[PDB]
Structures are given as C-alpha cells and as structure tokens.
C-alpha cells in the first residue's frame, strides 16, 4: 500500500470549455509555453498557495501562525508579494504573476532575449546564469534576490558584445510586461 | 482470446436497416462460445475461420450491448496477432 | 518465525539515532549490552556518522580494533556495542570526551566535555537485590551491578543516583531522590529538561509513580520517576546540555 509518486499538476474538469480554452491560448502565446501541462503546473502552484491561505484564515494559533509566517516569507522570497503583505493578498494573486516569475519571462525582460521563444532557447542551450549557476530549466521560478544576478554565461558567445545576436538584442533594449 | 467458429451477420433492431457482421468465437480459458462484432468495412473478409482473435468489450452502457446491435457484447481487436484496424486500413497484412 | 533477529532495517530502526533512514537498506543491529535499544546507539554510528572520523565501516572497525575509543574508561572493540545515556566516549589521541545524552527532540547527541568530568558517570540505581553472602546488589540502569553491604544498604535506595569513577568503579557522591534534588529527564515529552523536584505521586497498583519538577524559569512540569534522573542535590554538577 505504498507511496506512489503523484503528479504536481492538475488537469481541468472539462477539457473543452471555450472560455478556458481562449484564456489559456492567450496566456500560452504571450508567455511562449510548450505545454498546457506547464501552464497547469503553475496554476496548481497558485492553487496550493491559495488553499493554504484559506486554511490559515480559518485556523487557530501556535501553529497555523508559523505557517502563516512561512507562507508570507516564501512568497516574498519568490517575489510574488511585498514584505508588508497578507493572506488577502495571496488570494488576490494570479497565475500571470507566477509566469512572470519564470526565468523565460525574466530573460525576455532584462533585455536579454528579444522574444520569449529566444529566451527559451538561450536558457536551454546554456547561455543564462543565475547567481553564477547555469540553469537550463525555463520554468525555474526566480527568487526576487536572484533576479538582479541574471546574466549571460561566461562561456557563452552572447557574452561577447561583438556577437551578432547580442548586437540585435541590444539594438532592441526593451522590457516591462512580458 | 478465441477461435473463430463461424462468420455471421445480425440485423439491426427496428428503424435501422443493416446486417452487422460478426463471428461466433470459442474462448480458450473456458471453452465457451460468444459472438463478437467485427468493426470496419472489410473486416469480415480479413477474418477467416479457425483464426485466433482477441476479444474486447464493445463498450455499451452496462458493460453490454451497443447501439443498433441488439445482443452482441464483444468486439474483435486483433486477428492472428494483428490489429483489425490496421488490416482494414490496409497496413500490416495478416500472417495466416 | 523460527528464531531470533540478527538484522535491522534502517527504516525499522530506533527513532533516536540520527541515522539517515532511506539512504541504505540496513543498519547495525546493536548487540545486547549495557543499555537498551531505546536508550542506545552503536559505536559504529558514533565513530562514523557523529564524529566523522570515518566515512566507512571498515575504517571504523580498524580504529575500534586498534583501540582508540574508550567507553567509560574501557576499550571497546566491537562496532555493535551499545553506547547509552550519560555515557562517556573518550578519544585520548585527540583529547576529547563526549557525554552521550538525549536531545530535546528526543535523539541522542554527544555533548563535549573534559577529562575531569570524563572520569565520572552517574548511575540511577534502579533496583536492589539481596544476594548470597547476605550482600546487597544494586542493579543499575546501564545494566551494571555494584555490591555493597548491609551497613549502608539504607544509604542506598532504588531511584537514587550514584556518581561512579568508571575505570575503577568506586562510588563517590550518592545523590538521593528527594525534594529539591536537581534532576534531568531522559525520556518522554519533557526530555532534555531539568530542574528541582517538587512532588511525587504514587498511584496504587503497578501504575508508575510521577514526579513534579520545577525548571529554572519557574515553570512546573510532570514526568515519570523512572525518567527522572538525578544529577545533583541543588545543581546538576555534571554539565548536561
């Protein structure tokens, strides 16, 4: 009767709702996602945050206070909330905020990639460093403290400013919503 | 798994008019005869007698009969270790 | 089925060992010895995992057979030897001594100490037989046994503690179980907690007696008398935590 590793993403209750399909199609094009699986993964992350917040609203002390503090400091660390935040703000959060904390998206920002799809390729081909560490997982959620340490790899041609694609990417220095 | 005894045809209920093809099949684990429907268009021609055939459920509501086929509970799936869908669509010719 | 157990699976191991339960399949099954399985850990785990003087059991066994680790002043060459609560593990080549004591989490740890205290071992008396020769055998919680005489048989009582000079086994400083006695808990919920005794309740039949204990910060908590280990009259005098 043992453990049996379970999925960390939830699929929708109905597969063919026009509203959900349209919404997800838009998100997937905006954020350049390969998989509904990937999207639903981040949705499930959010859902678990929300459920914890709910429980801790409807909870009592000495524990469920610890977990309140832990939830809030985790979300601060991830960059989803400010330090002065609350469970009300958890419930205000969105999957878009999560996807904005992906690495692919921050690299489309930080003017490093010119396109989320090219950001994906840079990550996967090994041209992005986070705190000196090569990361190749574009779904990696960046911490708000690691965000300012994102850079091309030292062993990357894109780190040579003479590189053609680097020159194009910096011909278009842009950021903001991603 | 079963041995095809004979190839037959069954009349659709009342409003529909068609002769649904099927086979009487002797199952090996118990020696019991059940009738199975052969989906596809030339499936009954791709199937021959004394052939080993694999027997699924036909679907149907209570593990039972399906559609205008009154009293058939089973589907043919493989014929002499080859899928009937591929035989019907031409690919993967039959061994025997 | 047909007989005794010679093995132990690392998941089925004691909860008080600091063992890394999922890394391998097997664990050292302790030998019978001084203490119990619930209040002990094997010397291999002490030499290899706790102190880190070996990454491997072959190295550890070489060490132990060379004779570099004492347990209460005695060389112990077996890797399955039980090392228990309030035990002194000495390494002279390194000049280190450790007291095996429990944690607040309930697990066994090594508290570093020096030579002076390292020549001391407190022993809860835990029983008292009358043996042939009309002599008194004190039956102590490390499974040890000390013989005394019918003169001080009354100075010696069951729940008391005896400080013992261990490479020689000479009693010094009997510490009685009384009110005001400084105590160190060894098991339960209030594990690595200490204070002065306040009260004792008796509970008619085989229900164990219970002691009420006052900590340093004035708090006041109960536990079992058998789990209440006396370390001092008014001060622990054995450098506990």
């Amino acid at each position: 009767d043992p453990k049996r590793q379970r999925k960390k993403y939830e699929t929708p209750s109905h597969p063919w709702i026009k509203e959900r399909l349209d919404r997800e199609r838009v998100i997937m094009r905006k954020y350049a996602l390969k998989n509904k699986k990937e999207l639903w993964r981040h949705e499930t992350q959010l859902k678990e945050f929300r459920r914890r917040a709910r429980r801790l609203l409807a909870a009592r002390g000495k524990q469920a206070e610890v977990e309140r503090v832990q939830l809030l400091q985790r979300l601060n660390r991830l960059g989803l909330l400010p330090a002065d935040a609350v469970l009300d703000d958890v419930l205000s959060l969105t999957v878009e905020d999560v996807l904005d904390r992906r690495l692919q998206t921050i690299v489309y920002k930080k003017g490093l990639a010119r396109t989320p799809r090219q950001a994906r390729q840079l990550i996967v081909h090994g041209h992005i460093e986070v705190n000196g560490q090569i990361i190749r997982s574009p779904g990696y959620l960046v911490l708000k403290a690691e965000e300012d340490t994102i850079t091309y790899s030292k062993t990357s041609p894109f780190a040579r400013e003479s590189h053609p694609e680097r020159m194009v990417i910096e011909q278009a220095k842009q950021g903001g919503e991603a | 798994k079963g041995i095809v005894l004979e190839k037959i045809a069954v009349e659709a209920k009342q409003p529909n008019s068609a002769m649904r093809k099927a086979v009487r099949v002797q199952l090996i684990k118990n020696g019991k005869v059940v009738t199975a429907f052969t989906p596809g268009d030339g499936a009954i021609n791709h199937i021959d007698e004394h052939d080993e055939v694999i027997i699924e459920g036909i679907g149907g509501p209570k593990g039972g009969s399906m559609g205008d086929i009154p009293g058939i509970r089973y589907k043919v799936v493989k014929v002499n270790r080859v899928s009937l869908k591929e035989l019907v669509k031409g690919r993967k010719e039959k061994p025997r | 089925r047909k007989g005794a157990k010679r093995h132990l699976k690392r998941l089925a191991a004691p909860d008080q060992w600091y063992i890394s339960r999922k890394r391998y399949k097997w664990a050292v099954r302790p030998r019978p010895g001084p203490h119990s399985m619930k209040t002990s850990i094997p010397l291999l785990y002490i030499v290899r995992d706790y102190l880190g003087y070996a990454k491997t059991a072959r190295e550890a066994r070489k060490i132990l057979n060379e004779g570099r680790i004492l347990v209460d002043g005695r060389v112990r060459r077996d890797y399955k030897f039980p090392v228990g609560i309030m035990d002194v593990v000495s390494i002279p080549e390194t000049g280190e001594h450790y007291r095996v004591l429990p944690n607040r989490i309930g697990k066994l740890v090594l508290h570093p100490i020096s030579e002076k205290e390292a020549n001391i071992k407190p022993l809860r008396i835990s029983n008292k037989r009358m043996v042939k020769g009309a002599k008194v055998q004190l039956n102590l919680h490390d499974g040890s046994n000390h013989l005394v005489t019918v003169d001080d048989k009354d100075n010696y009582r069951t729940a008391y503690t005896v400080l013992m000079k261990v490479p020689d086994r000479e009693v010094i400083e009997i510490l009685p179980f009384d009110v005001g006695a400084y105590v160190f808990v060894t098991r339960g919920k209030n594990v690595a907690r200490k204070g002065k005794i306040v009260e004792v309740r008796r509970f008619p039949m085989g229900w164990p007696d219970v002691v009420t204990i006052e900590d340093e910060n004035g708090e006041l908590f109960d536990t079992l008398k058998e789990y209440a280990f006396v370390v001092g009259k008014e001060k622990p005098e054995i450098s506990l935590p």
Binding site: - | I3, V4, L5, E6, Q26, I28, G31, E49, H50, E52 | -
Partner: protein, 582 residues
C-alpha cells in the same frame, strides 16, 4: 506449432461423454482434428495437420489425458547465421560454461560444426543476410544484454587462446610433418607429454611418422596436440571417430583429467563416451540442411534419453515422431597373405566368402584392416598370397574422407552412375531417398557435413555396380539412425547384386546388425597383425572383446548398448560366462 497428444492410458471413451471432440472448435466448424478410430481401442486420435493447439480438449477431458506439445519450426527466432539465401540457418548458441565440459549431441546436418566455428571465431554469424560482410563489431552490439556477449567480447579481444580439433582429420593430416615425438615437443606448452602418452597409449606410435598413420592413431595425435596446447577454451569436433572402444574410453579419460578448469566443448556421436566425458549436453534439433535450434543444458543421461525418445521436457518439443530403435537383425577366396610395411608384420589366414554374405572386420586401432583393404583393391601387393578370382570388378571407399571435389552432388552421383539418381531404380528409392540426398542434390560438396559427405561416398561406392565392395570407416561422422539406415542400404544392395562386402568399422552394433560373418585381427598394435579365418558373429565379437577386456550390456526393451565399468559385477559375470556383448 503446438498440437495435442493423448496418453491413451488415462483415456476412457466410455466414462467421458467425449468432451474433447464435442468442445473442439475444428470439429464444430466442420473440420476434423480429433476423431474416434478403431486403429486404437475405439479411442480418439489427433491429426496434427489440423489441430491448432488451443487446449480446449485438454481442459475438458476429465481424466487429464490430453496435453499440448511443441513441434519445431523454421519461423521464429533471432537467426544467428545463414550460409546461403536458401541453404541453412541457425537459431541460438550454447554458452560455454567456465569450468564444465559441454556436449553437443544433435543429428547430422543441424549445426554442430557451425556452432563450433562461431564459438571458435573461425567464422562470423551474419545473423540475416549471408552478405553484409560485417563481423566482430555489430555482432557484439547485437548480442548485447547476454552472457555470451562476455564470451565473444573476450574472444574477439583475443583474451583467450582457443584451440580447435576439427572434424576432418585428413585435412588436418595434410598440414604437419616430422614424427609424433618432435611434433609434440614442438607444440607442447604444458609439459604433460608423458601423461598423454600413458593415457592415449601412444608408446608404439611414439616414433612412427605422421604420414604413415592409421586413422585412429592420427586422431590420437591430433587430440594430444590439442590437449598439450595451452588455452582457455578447448573444442573437440567428433574426437571419437576412427577409434576403437578402449581407445575412445582412454580419450575421454584424458580429456576430463587434463582439462578441469577450462571451457570445453565436445561434439560426438558416441552415446557411450558422451555419457562419460560430458557433464552437460546441449541438443541440436531441427531439419537437416534446413534449420537448427539449440536446446537447454540437459545433463548427460537425461539429454541422451531425451534425444532417443524424441521429446525434450523443457521446451516441450516433440522433435521426432518416433524413438530411436537400436534394431537387432564360393565367389572369392585367398591364401594366407603375409605383408610387411617396413615393420608391422601382417598375416591373415584365408577364408571363403560364400555368395553375397557380408564380412565384417574387427580389431584394435593399429593392426591391418586398411592395409588389408588396400591389398584387396590392389593399391598394395602382398609380400605373399593373393586373391582368387583376381581381376574382378571392384569398388572402394577408404577412411581418407575429406572435401576435395568442386562440383555438386548431382554431378558426383552422375559421374558415379545413372542408378544413383534415376528414380527408375530401386537403388534410388532405397539408398538416396532413405539417406536424404534428394535434399542436397544442388549443394556443392566442399560445403557439406561430415555425415552427408560420408553418405555421399557410400552412395557412389554402392552405385558403382561391382562384385567386390570395400568400405572402411563408413559409420564415422554419422549418427545412430543413419548408421542403421546405411547398414540396411548396404545389406540390400549387396544381397541384390549377390556380391561380396568387406566392412571395416569399430561399431559392433553395425556388425551385429548386418554381418553374417566377421574376421578378427589380433596381435601387438603396430608390430603384428594376426587375423584369422572368417568366424561367426558372436564368436568373433567375443574374441575381439576378450581382447581389450571390454564388456557390453544391452537393454532388452530397446537394445541400447552400454559399456560396463571395469571390474563391475556384470563385467565379471559376462566374462566368466563368455557372453561379451549380450
């Protein structure tokens, strides 16, 4: 191809309701696969040509009388080697077993020599296409996952110093000079020449030269060469050919005393020495000239009895419809020839050979019989004495068999005769069919099995209509059913032509089966060959066996002969009674 078989001891057609026939799909669909019969006691019979397996009858029979067996097939496997696009194929190889001695029993034409060459590195498998010219690499890559992978890895990395005694002793004879002593001291690397001599009884021939050697003397030499060579793997392809009973016993003893921590593989047709000499024996089954599959290990006595009964009870294969049987049953005179080839005096003590009766020739390995046949064919002329009537149409077949002709079998038999292949002939329908050469007509000869070749030379020799046939070592390289078939062929042709035949061999089964008289050679091997008048069968056998002090016991219900251990109760009894070979 799985079918059904009935036990007929558990079958009770009365107390059954005949559930088998009733719950058969084929009988129900109209065909016939099971049906009653008066060929048996009103009991059912199963026609394999129609049964599809499926076991309904098995699990409907109340008295669990029906079982499913397996028939072999040229369909399913991972073919290891194909010689030719339509010639022959092989499924599986046996693994050579670090320290044990492995036997490989099989039949004629099924893949023994082929297995051995694959394991010896002589040839590469070429799993499918005889073409594709790819060896060593892709073979290893394809055998990945197995333990034979390790074997071949070492073999092709030449991390083992394999030897190989080959099936064609004359093709080996051609490639060495000197005499035995310097041959052996030159080839040795282990220092056991004395031991080898004492075992294989090579004292007399210790100074004779290789070219003038008898068949078995030469065999002993090659076997000794192989033994003395140091290696990790030791392959012996039919090391019992041209030998006599005692010498092949000694040979087995030598092998299993001097090779005791080496991989050893042994192909041999002699069940006696395989019972001895083998720890395990793989069986090779199939259809001669078509396909061969290897079996499981099958310890020696079990493997033998299984090979004899057909059935192998680990693959659940019926490899033969029926069992081996072990059946039971003047025109020229001369003077007492004396002959002398440098040394080895020979005296023969004349006979009569009435009509077409067969004359066997028995004796040790090293006295006459080949000199004698050579004299009769006239290759050598006697120091004294001669045959009468001389100048008679003659044929011959020596023990110098090896592949030389470059044409095919149809040509061979053509230039031999017309009766060899004219289906007109009783000769054809008796010999060439029962020998199964119609399946080898379009096969070149230099690529044949030892037994197919032997059968061919015998066929030619008996197709040449004559009055004096002479066949030396005809049973060599042959299995047991073929031994008996060949014997029947000889007897048939000889009694049809009313001629003489002089069979030399070391197979008392053959001599007992056909020989209506025999001739025994006595004397010191290689020094003196003293034959005698033709003697009746049992007497000459008993004398030939009283010499060498060997004894045989035949099972009654089959007839399988087996040698009795020296000193055994039955040896002593059979000796003090004089009933050698009962």
């Amino acid at each position: 191809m799985r079918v059904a078989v009935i036990n007929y001891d558990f079958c009770k057609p009365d107390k059954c309701n005949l559930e088998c026939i009733n719950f058969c799909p084929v009988d129900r669909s109209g065909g016939k696969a099971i049906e009653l019969s008066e060929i048996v006691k009103g009991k059912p019979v199963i026609y394999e040509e129609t049964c599809i397996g499926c076991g309904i009858c098995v699990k409907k029979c109340p008295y669990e009388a029906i079982s499913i067996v397996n028939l072999p097939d040229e369909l399913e496997g991972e073919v290891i080697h194909r010689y030719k696009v339509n010639g022959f194929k092989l499924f599986g190889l046996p693994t050579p077993k670090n320290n044990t001695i492995l036997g490989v029993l099989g039949k004629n034409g099924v893949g023994k020599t082929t297995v051995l060459k694959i394991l010896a590195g002589e040839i590469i498998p070429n799993f499918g296409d005889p073409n594709s010219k790819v060896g060593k690499d892709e073979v290893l890559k394809r055998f990945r996952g197995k333990e034979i992978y390790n074997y071949f890895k070492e073999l092709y990395s030449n991390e083992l110093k394999i030897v190989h005694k080959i099936q064609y002793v004359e093709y080996a004879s051609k490639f060495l000079k000197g005499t035995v002593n310097e041959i052996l001291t030159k080839i040795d690397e282990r220092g056991k020449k004395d031991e080898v001599k004492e075992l294989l009884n090579m004292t007399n021939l210790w100074n004779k030269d290789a070219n003038i050697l008898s068949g078995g003397g030469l065999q002993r030499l090659l076997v000794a060469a192989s033994l003395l060579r140091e290696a990790d793997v030791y392959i012996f392809d039919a090391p019992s050919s041209y030998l006599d009973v005692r010498e092949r016993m000694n040979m087995a003893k030598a092998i299993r005393e001097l090779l005791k921590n080496k991989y050893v593989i042994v192909v041999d047709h002699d069940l006696i020495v395989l019972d001895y000499l083998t720890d395990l024996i793989h069986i090779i089954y199939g259809e001669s000239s078509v396909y061969g599959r290897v079996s499981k290990s099958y310890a020696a006595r079990v493997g033998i009895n299984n090979f004899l009964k057909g059935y192998l009870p680990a693959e659940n294969m019926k490899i033969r419809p029926d069992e081996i049987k072990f059946m039971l049953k003047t025109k020229m005179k001369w003077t007492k020839i004396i002959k002398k080839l440098g040394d080895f005096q020979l005296v023969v003590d004349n006979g009569e050979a009435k009509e077409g009766e067969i004359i066997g020739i028995l004796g040790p390995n090293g006295i006459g019989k080949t000199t004698f046949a050579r004299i009769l064919v006239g290759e050598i002329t006697a120091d004294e004495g001669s045959v009468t009537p001389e100048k008679q149409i003659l044929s011959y077949k020596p023990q110098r068999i090896f592949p030389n002709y470059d044409g095919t079998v149809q040509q061979y038999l053509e230039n031999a005769s017309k009766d060899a292949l004219s289906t007109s002939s009783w000769f054809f329908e008796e010999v060439t069919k029962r020998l199964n050469l119609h399946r080898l007509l379009e096969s070149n000869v230099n690529d044949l099995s030892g037994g197919e070749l032997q059968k061919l030379y015998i066929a030619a020799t008996l197709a040449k209509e004559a009055d004096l046939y002479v066949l030396d070592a005809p049973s060599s390289y042959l299995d047991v059913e073929e031994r008996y078939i060949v014997a029947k062929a000889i007897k048939r042709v000889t009694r049809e032509r009313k001629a003489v035949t002089f069979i030399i061999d070391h197979d008392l089964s053959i001599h007992d089966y056909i020989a209506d008289r025999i001739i025994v050679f006595k004397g010191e091997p290689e020094k003196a060959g003293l034959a005698t008048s033709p003697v009746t069968l049992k007497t000459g056998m008993n004398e030939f066996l009283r010499e060498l002090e060997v004894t045989f016991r035949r099972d009654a219900e089959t007839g399988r002969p087996r040698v009795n251990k020296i000193g055994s109760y039955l040896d002593r009894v059979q000796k003090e009674r004089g009933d050698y070979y009962s």
